[PDB]
Amino acid sequence: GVRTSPTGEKVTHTGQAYDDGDYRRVRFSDRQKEVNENFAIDLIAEQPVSEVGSRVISCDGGGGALGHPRVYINLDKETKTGTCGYCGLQFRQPHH
């Protein structure tokens, strides 16, 4: 998804927002402020949470050679669900 600034000015995922005057805005006049509609933060947050019953699970990210450097994230934290750094998708152990 994507939100809109008071000047309309669809705010990108980073949070950029030209304020009211901000003479630099004139470059978007007669043109379009290129913004990617797909926002990474909420486009991965809704992804299903993996349920694997092990303490350590690899996180190659699908297609080991084609994916990302395989990590060995720990699965013992029950407060929150441990996720790969590169992948971002979340691993949780079912009742550990």
């Binding site: 005057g21 901000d22 003479y23 630099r24 805005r25 004139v26 470059r27 006049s29 007669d30």
Partner: protein, 342 residues
């Protein structure tokens, strides 16, 4: 001042000065140079344009990338001006046609659109305005040029109380339509100056002088509401320029007096051309009109610019009109015209 408008850099091309110009009708003679001076320290101009972008192509290499934006704008439309002046620290007006047009008249180009841009600029929230008029702009002057300039002048002044006003005497430069206009008279035999042009005095102004005078006025905080007038260092009789610029062009000097009514007849005949007329009745009697000497109005010396002599920067422009037999002739051969002191 806004956080994004704090000036920086050494006044170079990619330096930021915090001034946001919106020069109007810059696709002309003096609009060319001010933008060139505007891009010197990196002031993002907007330069709304109405002609083909190709004719506006030559303005790109006067500023860093993204510093010279181009916006399509129509004078008759109202929202067209507003769409380019919302985010401008200053607004500079230079719109003006030196001849009559079917779709635009002297009144339309000198009171209609300068008042309109001034009122939206004040409405938008601009901080300054530089509306240029003529030093010779008299409400009851015979020329339609000067009377139209005068009525618009009080119009913009009333619309914008703080609108600094520039009235240069006469502009001479590379394509001034003033020096080259006199040089172009060779193709039509002798010079058709009425009564030998012995009864007309002018004080021309260099482009670099006036164009600089704009942004010194911009950077000066005391220029709000002033009515600066720019004049050259020396005045000269009309017959005193003609032979001088002919001599500095080394063209055959052939003065030829003729009646003014026939001079008007020639001006009207040249107006019938559907394309750009070579001369019009307005400039016919504008040439023989003599500038004032009013000293009460502040000059370019007030801001801190010295008015360069006409004879000094003349070789750059009149060299083109010379033939092969004088293309390499220096200005030592010519001599400065007989200045009329004040």
């Amino acid at each position: 001042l806004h956080h994004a408008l704090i000036p920086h850099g050494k006044g170079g091309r990619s330096s930021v000065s915090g001034i946001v110009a919106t020069v109007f009708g810059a696709t002309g003679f003096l609009g060319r140079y001010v933008v060139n001076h505007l891009g010197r320290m990196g002031s993002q101009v907007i330069v709304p344009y109405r002609c083909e972008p190709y004719d506006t192509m030559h303005l790109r290499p006067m500023g860093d990338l993204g510093q010279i934006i181009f916006m399509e704008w129509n004078g008759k439309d109202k929202d067209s001006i507003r769409k380019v002046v919302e985010h401008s620290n200053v607004v500079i007006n230079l719109v003006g046609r030196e001849w009559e047009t079917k779709n635009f008249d002297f009144e339309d180009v000198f009171v209609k659109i300068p008042h309109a841009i001034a009122q939206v600029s004040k409405e938008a929230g601009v901080e300054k305005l530089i509306h240029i008029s003529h030093l010779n702009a008299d409400i009851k002057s015979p020329s339609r040029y000067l009377r139209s300039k005068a009525v618009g002048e009080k119009e913009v002044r009333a619309a914008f109380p703080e609108a600094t006003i520039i009235k240069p005497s006469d502009i001479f430069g590379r394509e001034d339509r003033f020096l080259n206009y006199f040089a172009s008279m060779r193709w039509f035999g002798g010079v058709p100056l009425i009564s030998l042009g012995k009864e007309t005095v002018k004080q021309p102004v260099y482009i670099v002088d006036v164009s600089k005078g704009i942004i010194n006025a911009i950077k000066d905080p005391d220029a709000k509401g002033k009515t600066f007038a720019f004049v050259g260092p020396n005045r000269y009789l009309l017959f005193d320029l003609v032979q001088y610029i002919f001599a500095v062009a080394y063209r055959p000097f052939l003065p030829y007096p003729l009646p003014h009514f026939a001079y008007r007849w020639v001006g009207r005949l040249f107006e019938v051309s559907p394309f750009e007329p070579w001369t019009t009745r307005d400039k016919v009697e504008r040439v023989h009109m003599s500038d004032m000497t009013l000293p009460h109005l502040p000059g370019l010396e007030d801001l801190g610019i010295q008015a360069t002599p006409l004879e000094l920067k003349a070789i750059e422009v009149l060299r083109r009109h010379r033939t092969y037999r004088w293309l390499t002739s220096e200005m030592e051969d010519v001599k400065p015209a007989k200045t009329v002191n004040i």
